[PDB]
Structures are given as structure tokens and as C-alpha cells.
Ligand binder design. Sequence first.
Ligand SMILES: CCCCCCCCCCCC[N+](C)(C)C
Ligand SMILES: CCCCCCCCCCCC[N+](C)(C)C
Lengths: 157, 157
Amino acid sequence: LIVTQTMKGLDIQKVAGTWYSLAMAASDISLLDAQSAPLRVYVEELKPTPEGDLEILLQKWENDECAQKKIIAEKTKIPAVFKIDALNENKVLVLDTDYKKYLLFCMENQSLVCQCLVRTPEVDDEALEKFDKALKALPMHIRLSFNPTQLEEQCHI
Amino acid sequence: LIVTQTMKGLDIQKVAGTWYSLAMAASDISLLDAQSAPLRVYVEELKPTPEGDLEILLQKWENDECAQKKIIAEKTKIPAVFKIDALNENKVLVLDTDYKKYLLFCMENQSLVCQCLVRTPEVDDEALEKFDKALKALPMHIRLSFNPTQLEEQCHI
Ligand SMILES: CCCCCCCCCCCC[N+](C)(C)C
Ligand SMILES: CCCCCCCCCCCC[N+](C)(C)C
């Protein structure tokens, strides 16, 4: 685990609802460079299941269209870590959140993509600061940020 | 002028020689997102002419190849500002340099791309810090960084 900032005392029930992918960063440029890059995903809403698992609704650009996609991140013994059903099991870590404004997460395989999630389609400076802090610690090579207009569009167009 | 950090007392003669485009940032994602993006340029060497003008050698990915390109930035009454012969005259500003390790520059039209230039193919943390500082002041939405291996390749491949 490259990332070892996780949220202590996370209540996954309290992250339900709508989120905006305000900023994203990754360890390798090609993880995010193209609109159809594998890990360029835009989070729509988080749905924590009754048994503490986490279902994610997101949009992803795929073969010349902005696709709707659903993902279930299964819980682990660590509250801030979940595992996804990809070819390789790869983890989602929740680094920090105040539930009502921002959530920082990363997902990892060697590879790593992190996002600053926000509740509203606005530029939350403090959240972006918290994101930048969590990140200096990590080997990121691409960083993207979106304005309020792009945040209201499918696939941040 | 969005950017109003310029170097005081710049000696353009002392920026001659070889440079590495270690990091780049721009106000709009699409300025840098594709390998063939208009302002995704890799600086090879700077050649200040005798009358204080500045000739730039760079590489740019163009129609499935890494092209060699030459640009002359003409001097102005401001030592840290030069103008380029594009459809629109658009400025290059030198924000900071210690001549022997790093140079920060931006070029602007509304639009803006900035780079952290380094002398050697290494990751200069302090230079990257100076770049990050100069940047918080500016409305950047894409940031890229390259490792020593990519720095020795044509077009940072
Ligand atoms: C707490 C925040 C959790 C949000 C989780 C976001 C994970 C999305 C992973 C994309 C799936 C990868 N893919 C498509 C290549 C298989
Ligand atoms: C002091 C450092 C100065 C380096 C100057 C770099 C400017 C390159 C501008 C690319 C030309 C734009 N283009 C190709 C779209 C017409």
C-alpha cells in the first residue's frame, strides 16, 4: 500500500447520496490523459448497502459515448477500505471526509488514482487544499480539475 | 495579464543551453490532454540571440510523429517578457530562474500554459515546489509531471 492515509472512524452510511468528482489525480499520465482513459471516471452517487458494502454509480467515456456504470465495492475488516471485482482485486481507500462537503478517496492496484469528491457543483478551495496535502505524499504525474459548468455535464464535457 | 509573477533582473544570456520540461500546467484540460494537444511542447534548448531575442528549440507531437520545431520569441521593453509570432501575438513570461537548475515560465494568450524547466533529467523537488507556489495564484485545470526516464525520450514517451 502506497497510500497510508485513511479516515479513522468512518461511517460509510453517512457517505450516501450525490457526489461531484471535482479533481482527479493519478500516478501515471495515461491513467487519465484521454477522455476514454481506463480510470477517468466521474462519480454520480454513492449507495452503501445494508451489510456495509458500497455500491457506486459513475459515468465513463467509452467508444464515443458517456456511459452509465455501476460498481459494488465490497467491505473489508478495515472500515475505510473496500475491494472491487476487477480482474485483479484492487482496493478503494477513503482517506478523509466530513460527509457533508467533501470526500477524498484513492483506488489502487502499483497504480493509483485519487479524487476529491464534493457534494455541490462548486469549487471548494479547502477540500482542494486537503486533496493537495494528501497528495504530496504520493507519486502523482497527472492532475485534473473541473469548473462548475463541466460538473453539471455528463462526463464533465 | 493573469500572470503577474515575473523575474526581476533577468539576464536572458544566462538561460542559454539545454532544458528539460519537467512539469507543465494549463488553464484548460484540452490545452494539454492529448499527446498532440496544441500547447503540449517539450523544451530542448534555449538560444538567446545577440540583440536579446530568444530562440527556442522544442519537440511537439504532430500527426503521429515527434516533430522538431524552432520558435523565436522577440524581446520587449520588459526584460522578462517576450512575444511570439503566432496568429495572435501571445506573450512568454519568465517568472523565476536561478539559471543553473530551474526556470519557470508561462505563455499566455485568456489561455495559459506554464512549465517548470530543469537543467538535468532529475526530479528537482525544490523547483517543483517553486512551480506549485507560482501556480496556486493561477487558474490551472491540468497538471503533468515526467520521470527521469521519460525526460530522456523524444516527446517524453
Ligand atoms: C468512497 C469513494 C469510492 C468511489 C469508488 C470509485 C471507484 C471506481 C473504479 C472504476 C472501475 C475501474 N475499471 C472501470 C477500470 C474496472
Ligand atoms: C523562457 C522559456 C521560453 C520557452 C518558450 C516556450 C514557448 C513555446 C510556444 C509553443 C508555440 C505554440 N504553437 C505551436 C501553438 C504556435
